Design an enzyme around this catalytic site. Structure first.
Site, PDB file in Angstrom:
ATOM      1  N   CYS A 125      52.179  43.248  36.458  1.00 58.75           N
ATOM      2  CA  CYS A 125      52.827  41.922  36.415  1.00 58.75           C
ATOM      3  C   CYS A 125      52.115  40.946  37.310  1.00 58.75           C
ATOM      4  CB  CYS A 125      54.272  42.016  36.849  1.00 58.75           C
ATOM      5  SG  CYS A 125      55.254  42.863  35.571  1.00 58.75           S
ATOM      6  N   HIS A 136      60.571  37.383  38.653  1.00 59.60           N
ATOM      7  CA  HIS A 136      61.285  38.662  38.766  1.00 59.60           C
ATOM      8  C   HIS A 136      60.849  39.555  39.954  1.00 59.60           C
ATOM      9  CE1 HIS A 136      58.283  40.153  35.782  1.00 59.60           C
ATOM     10  NE2 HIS A 136      58.240  41.037  36.762  1.00 59.60           N
ATOM     11  N   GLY A 145      53.230  47.616  37.815  1.00 63.95           N
ATOM     12  CA  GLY A 145      52.484  46.923  38.869  1.00 63.95           C
ATOM     13  C   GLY A 145      51.437  45.908  38.419  1.00 63.95           C
TER      14      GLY A 145
END
Lengths: 306, 4, 306, 4
Positions: free
Chosen positions: A145, A41, A143
């Site tokens: 991820c 993503h 942030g």
């Protein structure tokens, strides 16, 4: 003595963390040899998250669509492929800090250390358990991820988690390092929610052993139970059923303390029915379920305080 | 339910 | 979202850990530049611990009395001095993994990460607080002596603790990196015991702010309190008295949530008198006191879930 | 009260 939620030392993992930017999205990636792993993503904007087609979004990208930064050094992407919910980015440089490693898929109830990172810079480390409902109770901001979970055996890092999303309850979901999610979750912004969770019985039991190894016997009783009579109690208190395999795993801890597993199960059964009221176990007011049998053996003395 |  | 006891990433500290042996005693030492720091009781046997004279025991040692091992590499000791309850060993090699560092003396109530080591090999990492009674609730086995505590600001490691002993309650005592002990404790085996402990009020308060920043307001009330009326309640519940300086420190958290400090103090005052009964705060059944205001700002979002 |  003492007993603490303890993480593995994070340095082997720290030297693997990079930053990955595609367009305006920035997140963390894991750099091993000539590959960088990250959430697919990263190729998404806010509006695509609602209904993304990753095959279609990805084919519109080149190698230089991706910026990888290791410290203040730019890595050049020279290949890219999608693997399930991950991207694999090939880079011009092998990570010289690559540890010995494995990619493992962790089972519900097992624990791992998370190294929370923002902008490819490690910021903190903590321990958590894969819940029966396939979520983790982590601490993660925007942030985070691509932050990873891991265990360490000797000098081999077993990576088992990469962070992808937060559910409306405040708990967290993500994937193994093959990009396959834990639980029924998907990397798009939809109505999906944690399933109902249960207490990890094996772990509670292990942590009662831990209490005994460190010198506390107050919650013991003169009773025993059948595996089946315990589960009728378990299930009414929303504990996972105990199986003969879980009884088996508790063998070494059982042997170190001289307490038969089903005898500790009677002790638990009584804690469920009667409460603790005012009393603590290993400092805790409640029954703790985020230490595996393995976590207890690793941390406790091999010698019981009899 | 946000991607983070 | 989420809120966890979080340690600093441990890799800067891991690359500093060595093993120090004198005679038959082996423990951990901290290797910065051309120096290795460790507990002076490395020169002691079990019988000297009862009544040791370190000046007399040390003068009987040479440089080659000490074996320092960094990985599988032997460091040669080329100088040694005693500093309070520490030994400083000069070695033939500067640590090339030496981070930017400082030696700080931590104040009661403050938190730090511990990297527990055995035989100079890091084995786990966890967070704890300096208690008002100058002990830490750590997890330490035989051989953990010389394990260090630290905080990390940017890329500077602030070392604040080296591990020395365990008291009869199961809690832990040690020194700053100048070899001066925290609390009234000494490195000999005598009858000495933790003094009476108190709850860290500032921290409890901070963690109530944390709860609000993450989105929970259930424990708030329509009341306010004077600083002095709160302390009359505090002191009966064995909390530290709150001072204007503690009220001050809570300024940023107060400003982020729009809750006046003395209004949060009334909210706490009511939690003490009325209990929580059945309800949790940030997952916790009890009032937590091992997060500083700083720990909350560092971990929480800068944006309140209003 | 042991040195560790």
């Amino acid at each position: 003595s003492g007993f603490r939620k303890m993480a593995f030392p994070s340095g082997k993992v720290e030297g693997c963390m990079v930053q990955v930017t595609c367009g305006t999205t920035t997140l963390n990636g894991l750099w091993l040899d000539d590959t960088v792993y990250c959430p697919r993503h990263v190729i998404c904007t806010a509006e695509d998250m609602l209904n993304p087609n990753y095959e279609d979004l990805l084919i519109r990208k080149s190698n230089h669509s991706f910026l990888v930064q290791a410290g203040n050094v730019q890595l050049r992407v020279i290949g890219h492929s999608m693997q399930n919910c991950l991207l694999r980015l090939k880079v011009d440089t092998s990570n010289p800090k690559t540890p010995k490693y494995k990619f493992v898929r962790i089972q519900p109830g097992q624990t791992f250390s998370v190294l929370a990172c923002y902008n490819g810079s490690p910021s903190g480390v903590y321990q958590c358990a894969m819940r029966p409902n396939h979520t983790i109770k982590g601490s993660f901001l925007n942030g985070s991820c691509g932050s990873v979970g891991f265990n360490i055996d000797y000098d081999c890092v077993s990576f088992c988690y990469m962070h992808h999303m937060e559910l409306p309850t405040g708990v967290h979901a993500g994937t193994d390092l093959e990009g396959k999610f834990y639980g029924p979750f998907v990397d798009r912004q939809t109505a999906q929610a944690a399933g109902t969770d249960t207490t990890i019985t094996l772990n509670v039991l292990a942590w009662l052993y831990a209490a005994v190894i460190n010198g506390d016997r107050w919650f013991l009783n003169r009773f025993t139970t059948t595996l089946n009579d315990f589960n009728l109690v378990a299930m009414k208190y929303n504990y996972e059923p105990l199986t003969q395999d879980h009884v088996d795993i508790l063998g070494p801890l059982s042997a170190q303390t001289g307490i038969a597993v089903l005898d500790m199960c009677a002790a638990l059964k009584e804690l469920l029915q009667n409460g603790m009221n005012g009393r603590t176990i290993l400092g805790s007011t409640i029954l703790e379920d985020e230490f595996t049998p393995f976590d207890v053996v690793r941390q406790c003395s091999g010698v019981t305080f009899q | 339910l946000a991607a983070x």
